[PDB]
Amino acid sequence: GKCRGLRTARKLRSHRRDQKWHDKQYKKAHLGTALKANPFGGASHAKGIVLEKVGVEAKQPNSAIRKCVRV
Amino acid sequence: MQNDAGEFVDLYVPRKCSASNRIIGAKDHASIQMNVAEVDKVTGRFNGQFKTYAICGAIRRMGESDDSILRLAKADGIVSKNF
Amino acid sequence: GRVRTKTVKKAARVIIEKYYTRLGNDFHTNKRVCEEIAIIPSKKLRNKIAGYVTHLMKRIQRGPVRGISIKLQEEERERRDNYVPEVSALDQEIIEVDPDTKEMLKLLDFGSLSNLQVTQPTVGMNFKTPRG
Amino acid sequence: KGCEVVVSGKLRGQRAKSMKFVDGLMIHSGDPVNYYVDTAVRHVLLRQGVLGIKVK
Amino acid sequence: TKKRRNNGRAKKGRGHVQPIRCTNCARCVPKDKAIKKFVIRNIVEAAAVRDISEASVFDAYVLPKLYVKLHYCVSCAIHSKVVRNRSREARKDRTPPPRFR
Amino acid sequence: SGALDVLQMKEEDVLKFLAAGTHLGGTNLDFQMEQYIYKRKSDGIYIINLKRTWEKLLLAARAIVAIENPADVSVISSRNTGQRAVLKFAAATGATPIAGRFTPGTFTNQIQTAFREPRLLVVTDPRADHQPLTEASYVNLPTIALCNTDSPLRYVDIAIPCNNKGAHSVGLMWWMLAREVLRMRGTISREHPWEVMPDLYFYRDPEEIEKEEQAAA
Amino acid sequence: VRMNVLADALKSINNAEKRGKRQVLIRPCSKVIVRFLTVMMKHGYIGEFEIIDDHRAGKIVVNLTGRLNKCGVISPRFDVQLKDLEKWQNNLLPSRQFGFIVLTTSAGIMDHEEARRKHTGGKILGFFF
Amino acid sequence: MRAKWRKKRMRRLKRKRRKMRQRSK
Amino acid sequence: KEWLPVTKLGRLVKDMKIKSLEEIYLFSLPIKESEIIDFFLGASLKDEVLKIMPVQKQTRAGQRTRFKAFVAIGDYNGHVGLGVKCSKEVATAIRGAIILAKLSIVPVRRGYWGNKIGKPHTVPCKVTGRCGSVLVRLIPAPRGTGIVSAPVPKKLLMMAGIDDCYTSARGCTATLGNFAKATFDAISKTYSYLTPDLWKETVFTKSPYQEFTDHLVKTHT
RNA sequence: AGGUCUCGUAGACCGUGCACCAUGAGCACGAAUCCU
RNA sequence: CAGAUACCGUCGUAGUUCCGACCAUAAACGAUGCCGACCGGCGAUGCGGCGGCGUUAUUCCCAUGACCCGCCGGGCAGCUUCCGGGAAACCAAAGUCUUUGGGUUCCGGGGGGAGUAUGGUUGCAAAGCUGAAACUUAAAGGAAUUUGGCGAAGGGCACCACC
RNA sequence: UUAAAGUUGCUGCAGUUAAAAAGCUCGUAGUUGGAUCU
Ligand SMILES: [Zn+2]
């Protein structure tokens, strides 16, 4: 810190809270939208039903047909 | 450096500079081994004994080694007192 | 043109460094000297070596040299370094003495000697020639 | 006093690259090249092609 | 990076200078940044001064000079070869080149 | 020089100093030469105090004679003002001379032909011989430089303030430094005038050489 | 403006010790400052020192030696206990065999070892090693 | 594409969609 | 086969006159041969290579690759060194790296922690080094802790004879040459930090140049 | 009364100009493990 | 010009100019917050004060202006370096920092999305202030050395270039 | 989810050029405030 008073605690705490809010990994875990937009809803595994088999391509120079399943 | 036994344990002791009273490292190559010859008091010829000093390299690189040698000569009385 | 390379120059410089007393300005003598003390497998190189030795001996006989070192310390400059005048060039009958230097004599150890004369003040002007 | 060994031909691929290995003192021009260096050019037979040797 | 200690100008504690116009171009270059030229020359140059001398009603008449000040944009100052480029170590020379001719 | 009264200005050394011109210097001040000086005058020539110059000349003489072997004392000059003086100084004392175009790496590069590992360096001028002072940092070489009022004091150990621009001044001071070290070595007595010639250490131009040898016999 | 006088005094004497100057001028003075260099000089880190006693805040000139590495302050003056003293000297000192902590104490301004051996403590001032 | 004309295009798009929203009501 | 020297120190160490290299470290004399170290240190001086990397300047004829080789040297009773030599062939680069590390070995002192009992095991103070953008700290440790650090300063501190310490590193420590030189000039700073037991006035003995100068000037020209 | 004052060399500016780019598949390629 | 509602040239509305009512955005940049302490040398310039040979407003004496030699304090600036620092360009501050702590405001956590959407607020209008997320990627960037390439400049050589 | 993260820095980060000092000034809380009393 650079605000170094003996009676400076609430200013340092509020500044630390704001600068910790200015983050990405903390903002992912402490917001409702980042977990609401997750397909599992915060779960490790999930079950599903297969409706169509889709084959997708690859990226740059490495090129192969990678086979996936739409669930 | 001593210990609780009572005998010396360090491999060697480094020298001390005579102006800023710092040590001279083993890889500092700008140190001085200046000797000033004091003479006999009724003839003026060299007697045989020397008078050694040591100045570290930072004092040389700042440029104040000459006035340092002058002050050590003033303290040892080799140079004249009034100057 | 006739610009010679470093081989003949270095060979002539080292043979004039090692041998300075047994040579001279005569081309047909020191050519056979550098034959008999140095093994040169060619002839044109020997001719260039002897010519360059003659040129550098003319150069060192005229004046000082800046390429080699000397042990006979150059007789033609030795005579100029050893000639002496009768006057010692410092015991002048009168010295132009600054009054500041007159006070320097006055305060250090001495008073007013006859060899030092107080200069009249001709210092009414100043210094630092104009630079802008 | 010195040597030059060079191998040319097909070496690990289809493009023919040549590799040169030099050391020591070596002259390249003059009359003493006739009687200070020696030349030898040989052709080596392999299953995939031929390789050249110019040792000196 | 920062090429020069200053910025090609002579402004240190001002923040604003009056703009001027170039002679060849019409660029609104600032006054302290532009290359300013002050040249002196005769009214007619030395290809005809003897013929002017032997055409006068006066005796040993002195030909008058011409005075003009030129303001150059730096692109025009390099395109017209008034000032060239230098090395890194040669850039620290504020003195003008010597005028032998 | 000590409190003993055998090592001061007898009567004539100050007269030789005022005749040669070892008392007046340049025209700019130096912050390490604020005590080896008295006052700037009109015409802007600073005046060097002379007793301090004498005391550091004794100090440099003591530092030279303090080492036992004189063969490893490198005396250095590159300027044309003191080429002859350092050569005859090395002839008088037994020192090792370097006169004109000091080779870089003489004390550092050890496989070259011009290699020397000395113990003391004696320098004519610090500004002109800035290259021996740089090479004196990598190896333990104390140095003595005949300094001026316009000479930077870098990597130096004993400074003798003098006007090192006139040939008479440097020739006389090199000569009397040789005189002092041969007096301290135990070969030259102080009681009698032994002196060969003060002009014998003087550099002189070829034009004045030619005209005075044509005028004289 | 100037608030911590001891911080300015120790920064000045640290710069003088770093550049090898034998004496330094300290422009203001206080009883806490002269007691701090009394602690330093009793411990043997520095030498003699004068006080320029005039009708304003005094000036201190010191006789430095080469036995000094660094002078520092702790700002603001935190309070410590006997339990938390080892926490301060574990991370504030280069070694456990030398170096001292000067802290204000009701028994007098004094080093950390005396405060340990008489069992009291207080607000901290600075350090030297 | 530098930032000036990108900002100008975003400004024009925002002005067009704001005009369409304010005239759509 | 037989060694003939260049400088005066070769005569001084071969004429049975310099008993130990601690005098050379005391007077801070420069060293310029990789063989006085061979005279004073026997088979205790190990050699382990740290890293081989290629460096490329590239011209119209493509890139040509010379090879840079870091090596760390040191006996296990004190002295430790480092040297970097870059050339074309691997073997002569390795040999030149051994030579240049063999010249620049620095002596070190070791301290205690808490109580001064037995032989020393850790660094006496907190010393650091500065090169590039890396930091190497040397914090003293209680006995039996061991060296906790990256593997390269683990190798350096085990080879130097340091039994135990604590370290901390900051910056881009991926560059092993800069990090190793930071460790080298951190451990070389264990002298240059004045401690209160070194407070007494030193005595200067006779320099080895003054000791045998009359024999030296007659045993070499 | 002499009548072409002596000595040395840059003293070069003096009339020079331009309509323009749209042209486009490629790049890698060794250490043996060395005493030496 | 292959193609100009571009570079170039001739006209030309609103503006460029004044008084009052607005908006508050610039490479508003020394791309470096403010106060205070410490830490090298040198030469100049602007202001105020102070000391001193000499010249001038014609010749003698005082004060004023001018010139010259210094000193002090504040300010825009300049040259050099192993004080020191930095990744390096470079810096007397960007120094006094693992040997970290003089006091105190604003502000940044890979690159895009994005200064975008929504909500508020201000404004006649244009538009300023606060300001995300979903998704996507393993790079985006800073300093600097060698051949490379110029519709950049400066030189050298050649009767397979010229006179 | 924690340590490695000195990439949330109170110990203990950065703001000339990589992410960054409001265009500038005034101004009430909040913070920090010269010496001296046995
Ligand atoms: Zn223009």
Give the CATH number, domain containing residue I59: 3.30.160.20
Please name the helix (run of DSSP H) or strand (run of DSSP E) that holds residue D22, with its range, or none: strand D19-24
Contact I187, I160 (CB under 8 A): yes
User: Strand K: which of residues 1-30 in chain A lie with Cβ below 7 A?
Assistant: 2-5, 8, 11, 15, 19, 22-24, 27-28
- Yes or no, beta carbons of I126 and G66 under 8 Å apart: no
CA to C1' distance (Å), from I172 to K145:
22
DSSP F39-98: -B-TTS-BB--HHHHHHHHHHHHHHHHHSS-STTEEEEE-SGGGHHHHHHHHHHH-PEEE
Residue G31 Cβ under 7 A from any strand L atom = yes
Chain I contacts of F112, Cβ < 8 Å? none
* Helix extents (H) in chain C: 6-18, 27-37, 44-62, 75-82, 99-108
How many other C-beta atoms can be found within 10 angstroms of the C-beta atom of residue B1? Answer: 17
Contact G100, G111 (CB under 8 A): yes
Nearest to G26 by CA among G50, G54, G55, G1: G50
- For F8, the closest chain C residue by CA position comes to C109
Nearest to I50 by CA among I126, I152, I200, I118: I152
The domain segmentation of chain G, as residue ranges, is 1-68, 69-129
| Pairing relationship of beta strands F120-123 and F73-77 according to DSSP bridges | parallel
- Report the alpha-carbon distance of residue G42 to residue G36 in Å, rounded: 10
- Report the alpha-carbon distance of residue A8 to residue A27 in Å, rounded: 26
The domain segmentation of chain B, as residue ranges, is 1-83
Closest-lying nucleotide for D14 based on CA to C1': J29
CA atoms within 13 A of residue F155's CA, in its CB half-sphere: 23
- Report the alpha-carbon distance of residue F119 to residue F140 in Å, rounded: 8
Question: Which pair of tokens denotes residue G108?
Answer: 């007098």
- Report the alpha-carbon distance of residue G46 to residue G17 in Å, rounded: 10
Closest-lying nucleotide for A26 based on CA to C1': L8
B–A contact: 3+ Cβ pairs < 8 A = no
Residues contacting G88, CB < 8 A, separation 6+: G80, G101, G124
Q: Is I115 helix (H, G, I), strand (E, B) or coil?
A: strand
Q: What are phi and psi of G5, to 5 degrees?
A: -70, -40
Q: Radius of gyration (Cα) for chain C, nearest Å?
A: 28
- Yes or no, beta carbons of G77 and A6 under 8 Å apart: yes
I124/G contact by beta carbon, under 8 A:
yes
C-alpha G82 to ligand 1 mean position (Å)? 78
Question: Which pair of tokens denotes residue E46?
Answer: 């030395």
Largest CA distance in chain D: 41
- Report the alpha-carbon distance of residue I72 to residue I66 in Å, rounded: 20
With 0-12 CB in 10 A as exposed, 13-18 as middle and 19+ as buried, what is F176? buried
Q: Is F109 helix (H, G, I), strand (E, B) or coil?
A: coil
CA F139 to chain C, closest CA, distance in angstroms equals 26
* Helix extents (H) in chain G: 5-18, 31-43, 85-91, 112-118
Residue G29 Cβ under 7 A from any strand L atom = yes
- Report the alpha-carbon distance of residue G19 to residue G79 in Å, rounded: 33
- Report the alpha-carbon distance of residue F119 to residue F110 in Å, rounded: 16
How many other C-beta atoms can be found within 10 angstroms of the C-beta atom of residue B21? Answer: 17
Residues contacting I51, CB < 8 A, separation 6+: I69, I70, I176, I177
What are the C-alpha distances in Å from I41 to residues I38, I45, I76, I81, I104?
Answer: 5, 7, 11, 13, 14
Question: Which pair of tokens denotes residue E24?
Answer: 């060849």
Residues contacting D11, CB < 8 A, separation 6+: D17, D19, D51
Characterise B35 by phi-psi region: left (phi > 0), alpha (psi -120 to 50), beta (else). beta
Contact B44, F183 (CB under 8 A): yes
C-alpha E70 to ligand 1 mean position (Å)? 10
Q: What are phi and psi of F21, to 5 degrees?
A: 110, 40
- Report the alpha-carbon distance of residue I198 to residue B24 in Å, rounded: 13
- Yes or no, beta carbons of G20 and B16 under 8 Å apart: no
I6/F contact by beta carbon, under 8 A:
yes
Q: Is I1 helix (H, G, I), strand (E, B) or coil?
A: coil
Contact G102, G36 (CB under 8 A): yes
- Report the alpha-carbon distance of residue F200 to residue D6 in Å, rounded: 68
Nearest to C96 by CA among F22, F18, F26: F18
- Report the alpha-carbon distance of residue I99 to residue I44 in Å, rounded: 16
Instruction: Label residues C12-50 b or e (16+ Cβ within 10 Å = b).
Output: bbebbeeeeeebeeeeeebbebbeeeeeeeeeeebebbb
Contact B67, F158 (CB under 8 A): no
Of G67, G69, G96, the CB nearest to I114: G96
DSSP assignment letter at I174: T
- Report the alpha-carbon distance of residue I129 to residue B13 in Å, rounded: 22
Of I117, I195, I198, the CB nearest to B4: I117
- For I195, the closest chain B residue by CA position comes to B1
| Pairing relationship of beta strands I165-166 and I147-148 according to DSSP bridges | parallel
How many other C-beta atoms can be found within 10 angstroms of the C-beta atom of residue I195? Answer: 20
Nearest to F143 by CA among I206, F109, F135, F151: F135
Contact G35, G5 (CB under 8 A): no
Nearest to I164 by CA among I129, I127, I112: I112
- Report the alpha-carbon distance of residue I30 to residue I12 in Å, rounded: 14
Q: Is C69 helix (H, G, I), strand (E, B) or coil?
A: coil
- Cα angle value I54/I55/I60 (rounded, 5°): 120
Cis peptide before G76 (omega within 30 of 0): yes
- Cα angle value F168/F169/F175 (rounded, 5°): 85
Amino acid at F144: I
- G 68-127 → A contacts, CB under 8 A: 75-78
Please name the helix (run of DSSP H) or strand (run of DSSP E) that holds residue H5, with its range, or none: helix H3-24
| Pairing relationship of beta strands I105-106 and I127-131 according to DSSP bridges | unpaired
Q: Which of I122, I199, I200 to mutate to test the interface with G (most CBs of G within 10 A)?
A: I199
Contact C95, F19 (CB under 8 A): yes
| Pairing relationship of beta strands F120-123 and D50-55 according to DSSP bridges | unpaired
Would you give the distance in Å from CA C118 to the centre of its chain? 38
Residues contacting D46, CB < 8 A, separation 6+: none
- Report the alpha-carbon distance of residue I28 to residue I21 in Å, rounded: 10
- Report the alpha-carbon distance of residue D54 to residue D7 in Å, rounded: 7
Amino acid at I192: S
Method: cryo-EM
CA C36 to chain F, closest CA, distance in angstroms equals 26
Closest-lying nucleotide for I171 based on CA to C1': L6
Question: Which pair of tokens denotes residue C59?
Answer: 């150069």
Q: Is I170 helix (H, G, I), strand (E, B) or coil?
A: strand
Amino acid at F185: R
Paired residues of I128 in beta bridges: I137
- Report the alpha-carbon distance of residue F87 to residue F80 in Å, rounded: 12
- Report the alpha-carbon distance of residue F185 to residue F68 in Å, rounded: 10
| E25 among annotated binding-site residues | yes
DSSP assignment letter at B51: -
Chain B contacts of I106, Cβ < 8 Å? 26-27
- The residue whose CA lies nearest the C1' of nucleotide K55 is C125
**What does this entry list as its resolution, in Å?**
3.8
Contact F105, F139 (CB under 8 A): no
Chain G contacts of A5, Cβ < 8 Å? 76
Contact E22, E76 (CB under 8 A): yes
Contact I79, I41 (CB under 8 A): yes
How many other C-beta atoms can be found within 10 angstroms of the C-beta atom of residue G12? Answer: 16
- Report the alpha-carbon distance of residue B10 to residue I198 in Å, rounded: 11
CA to C1' distance (Å), from I196 to K163:
88
- Tally: H helices and E strands in chain B: 2, 0
Question: Which pair of tokens denotes residue F32?
Answer: 């390490």
| Pairing relationship of beta strands C116-118 and C95-97 according to DSSP bridges | parallel
Please name the helix (run of DSSP H) or strand (run of DSSP E) that holds residue E42, with its range, or none: strand E35-42
Contact I82, I181 (CB under 8 A): yes
Residue I4 Cβ under 7 A from any strand J atom = no
Residues contacting G38, CB < 8 A, separation 6+: none
Contact G62, G13 (CB under 8 A): yes
Nearest to F68 by CA among I215, I21, I15: I215
Residues contacting A37, CB < 8 A, separation 6+: none
- Yes or no, beta carbons of G98 and I126 under 8 Å apart: no
| Pairing relationship of beta strands F73-77 and F96-99 according to DSSP bridges | parallel
Contact F77, F89 (CB under 8 A): no
Torsion G28-G30-G36-G37 (CA) sign: positive
Closest-lying nucleotide for G75 based on CA to C1': K101
Length of chain G measured in residues: 129
Q: Radius of gyration (Cα) for chain H, nearest Å?
A: 11
Interface of B with F (CB under 8 A): 29-39, 41-46, 50, 55, 57, 60-61, 63-67, 69-70, 73, 77-81, 83
Of F65, F138, F142, the CB nearest to B29: F138
Paired residues of G79 in beta bridges: G123
Would you give the distance in Å from CA A62 to the centre of its chain? 28
User: Strand J: which of residues 32-51 in chain E lie with Cβ below 7 A?
Assistant: 41, 45-48
- Report the alpha-carbon distance of residue G11 to residue G128 in Å, rounded: 12
User: Strand K: which of residues 158-177 in chain I lie with Cβ below 7 A?
Assistant: 168, 170
What is the end-to-end Cα distance of chain H in Å, rounded? 35
The domain segmentation of chain F, as residue ranges, is 13-217
What are the C-alpha distances in Å from E92 to residues E7, E12, E13, E33, E86?
Answer: 14, 18, 22, 17, 10
Residues contacting I12, CB < 8 A, separation 6+: I18, I208, I212, I216
Residues contacting I30, CB < 8 A, separation 6+: B29, F138, F139, F140
CA I115 to chain F, closest CA, distance in angstroms equals 39
Chain I contacts of B5, Cβ < 8 Å? 117
What are the C-alpha distances in Å from H4 to residues C15, C128, H1, H7, H17?
Answer: 78, 57, 8, 5, 20
Please name the helix (run of DSSP H) or strand (run of DSSP E) that holds residue I148, with its range, or none: strand I147-148
Q: Whose structure tokens read 């705490």?
A: A13
- Report the alpha-carbon distance of residue E29 to residue E9 in Å, rounded: 11
Nearest to F23 by CA among G50, C96, E88: C96
Q: Which of F65, F69, F115, F120 to mutate to test the interface with I (most CBs of I within 10 A)?
A: F69
C-alpha G75 to ligand 1 mean position (Å)? 60
Torsion F169-F174-F179-F183 (CA) sign: positive
- Report the alpha-carbon distance of residue I65 to residue I88 in Å, rounded: 7
- The residue whose CA lies nearest the C1' of nucleotide L16 is E2
Contact C13, C56 (CB under 8 A): yes
- Report the alpha-carbon distance of residue G98 to residue G89 in Å, rounded: 11
- Report the alpha-carbon distance of residue G61 to residue I128 in Å, rounded: 33
Amino acid at C107: L
- Report the alpha-carbon distance of residue C61 to residue C76 in Å, rounded: 7
The residue segments making up the domain with residue I62 are: 8-106
- Report the alpha-carbon distance of residue C105 to residue C112 in Å, rounded: 8
Contact G64, G17 (CB under 8 A): yes
Residue E57 Cβ under 7 A from any strand J atom = no
What are the C-alpha distances in Å from F84 to residues A8, C23, C83, E36, E61?
Answer: 76, 26, 14, 54, 62
Residue G59 Cβ under 7 A from any strand K atom = no
CA B58 to chain I, closest CA, distance in angstroms equals 13
What are the C-alpha distances in Å from I117 to residues B4, B9, B13, I82?
Answer: 6, 11, 20, 31
Question: Which pair of tokens denotes residue I38?
Answer: 């061979």
Please name the helix (run of DSSP H) or strand (run of DSSP E) that holds residue F88, with its range, or none: helix F83-93
CA atoms within 13 A of residue I220's CA, in its CB half-sphere: 16
Q: Radius of gyration (Cα) for chain F, nearest Å?
A: 18
I201/G contact by beta carbon, under 8 A:
no
- Report the alpha-carbon distance of residue G89 to residue G112 in Å, rounded: 9
- Yes or no, beta carbons of F115 and I6 under 8 Å apart: yes
DSSP A24-51: SHHHHHT-HHHHHSSSSSS-S-------
Question: Which pair of tokens denotes residue B45?
Answer: 């010829």
- Report the alpha-carbon distance of residue D21 to residue D53 in Å, rounded: 12
- Report the alpha-carbon distance of residue C117 to residue C96 in Å, rounded: 6
Contact G102, G121 (CB under 8 A): no
Of F69, F110, F140, the CB nearest to I7: F110
Residues contacting I212, CB < 8 A, separation 6+: I12, I15, I17
What are the C-alpha distances in Å from I112 to residues C15, E51, G89, I117, I155?
Answer: 67, 102, 17, 8, 21
- For A4, the closest chain G residue by CA position comes to G76
Nearest to B55 by CA among B28, B78, B82, B75: B28
How many other C-beta atoms can be found within 10 angstroms of the C-beta atom of residue F36? Answer: 23
With 0-12 CB in 10 A as exposed, 13-18 as middle and 19+ as buried, what is I132? middle
CA G76 to chain A, closest CA, distance in angstroms equals 6
DSSP assignment letter at F151: -
- Report the alpha-carbon distance of residue F68 to residue G117 in Å, rounded: 58
Length of chain A measured in residues: 71
Amino acid at I217: V
